[PDB]
Design a protein around this ligand. Structure first.
Ligand code: NI
Length: 341
């Protein structure tokens, strides 16, 4: 059964609610983004209207085979009327196609649902600038001050400089990057660009990237592994065994692997600065864990909320324990007393 923090009061609408069968009273299901915890339930058999971005819609049609008659893509930054209710989709700065959704309720209440997001000051100059939000349904993934990590741009600078140095010292090195969902594509795209290569991958992953409206993509990626010196592998293969196994398949072209494992936050962010990060190494294989986050840091989150000044906050992540719920409520009250709303 559908939980309350996925329901939008006073509408026939749910958000990211596809795993509960038919939801009593729902005339339109919104999908914020193509991650499995959020789409869980969609297939070729779905016969209700799905409202989403153009990129999410491409992924539903090609990867999950949802029939085209039930896909309703909406443009971003544009007032749209759905079942007699004004809505707007906003870029969430998460993975490709991910949105926030602003709902203008018939009773005058305004609701923002962030989906999954990485708060940014640029959001302060979207269509949110105008106005009051009575209810914020907030991605609280990292809602505690211990959760610190660098900018995406700093992490990508470290990855480019690390890969360009290694391959200039050894032209016979291969670079390997792990993936398991959409998002974080800048990590392998920026590496391949500095090295003058296309990115090599499986047929399945190529098909997924072809859905994402990335400009000039045909110039950047390939299924011909032999032609590429940056390879993508599933994340589960990014270990000494799985990397050794890969190196054998490459026909003695290469005598070293440098591999990247993009993660979210890890506890080594408490101690070690991005500049100071070192790899795990066995023989001719080296693995770097890099904290490339597509969710708000605590500080980013706090800034966004203190700017927006919502009347009420409903968390959508870490809601399962009394201690988690309590911690988050303590922070929402501090932020409100500090800023005066
Ligand atoms: Ni997500």
């Amino acid at each position: 059964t559908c939980p309350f923090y996925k329901k939008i009061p006073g509408t026939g609408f749910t958000v990211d609610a596809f795993q509960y069968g038919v939801v009593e009273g729902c005339t339109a299901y919104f999908l914020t983004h193509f991650h499995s915890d959020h789409y869980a339930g969609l297939s070729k058999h779905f016969t209700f209207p799905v409202y989403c971005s153009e990129i999410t819609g491409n992924l539903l049609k090609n990867k999950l085979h949802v029939q085209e008659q039930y896909i309703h893509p909406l443009p971003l930054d544009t007032e749209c009327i759905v079942n007699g209710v004004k809505v707007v989709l906003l870029d969430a700065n998460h993975c490709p196609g991910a949105v926030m959704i602003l709902f203008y309720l018939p009773n005058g209440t305004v609701i923002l649902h962030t989906g999954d997001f990485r708060a940014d000051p640029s959001m302060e100059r979207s269509l949110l600038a105008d106005q009051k939000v009575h209810m914020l349904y907030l991605d609280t993934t990292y809602c505690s001050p211990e959760y610190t990590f660098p900018s995406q741009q700093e992490v990508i600078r470290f990855a480019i400089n690390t890969a360009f140095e290694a391959v200039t010292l050894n032209p016979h090195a291969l670079v390997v990057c792990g993936t398991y969902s959409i998002g974080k594509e800048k990590v392998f795209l920026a590496i391949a660009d500095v090295l003058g290569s296309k990115v090599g991958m499986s047929q399945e992953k190529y098909k997924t990237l072809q859905c994402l409206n990335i400009p000039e993509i045909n110039s950047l990626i390939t299924t011909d592994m032999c032609s590429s010196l940056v390879h993508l592998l599933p994340m589960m293969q990014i270990n000494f065994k799985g990397l050794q196994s890969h190196l054998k398949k490459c026909g003695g072209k290469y005598n070293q692997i440098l591999a990247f494992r993009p993660t979210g936050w890890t506890h080594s962010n408490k101690f070690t600065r991005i500049a100071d990060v070192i790899p795990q190494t066995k023989g001719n294989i080296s693995i770097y864990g890099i904290p490339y986050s597509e969710h708000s840091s605590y500080l980013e989150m706090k800034r966004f909320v203190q700017w927006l000044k919502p009347q009420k906050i409903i968390p959508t992540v870490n809601v399962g324990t009394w201690k988690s719920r309590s911690t988050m409520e303590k922070y929402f009250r501090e932020w409100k007393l500090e800023a005066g709303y």
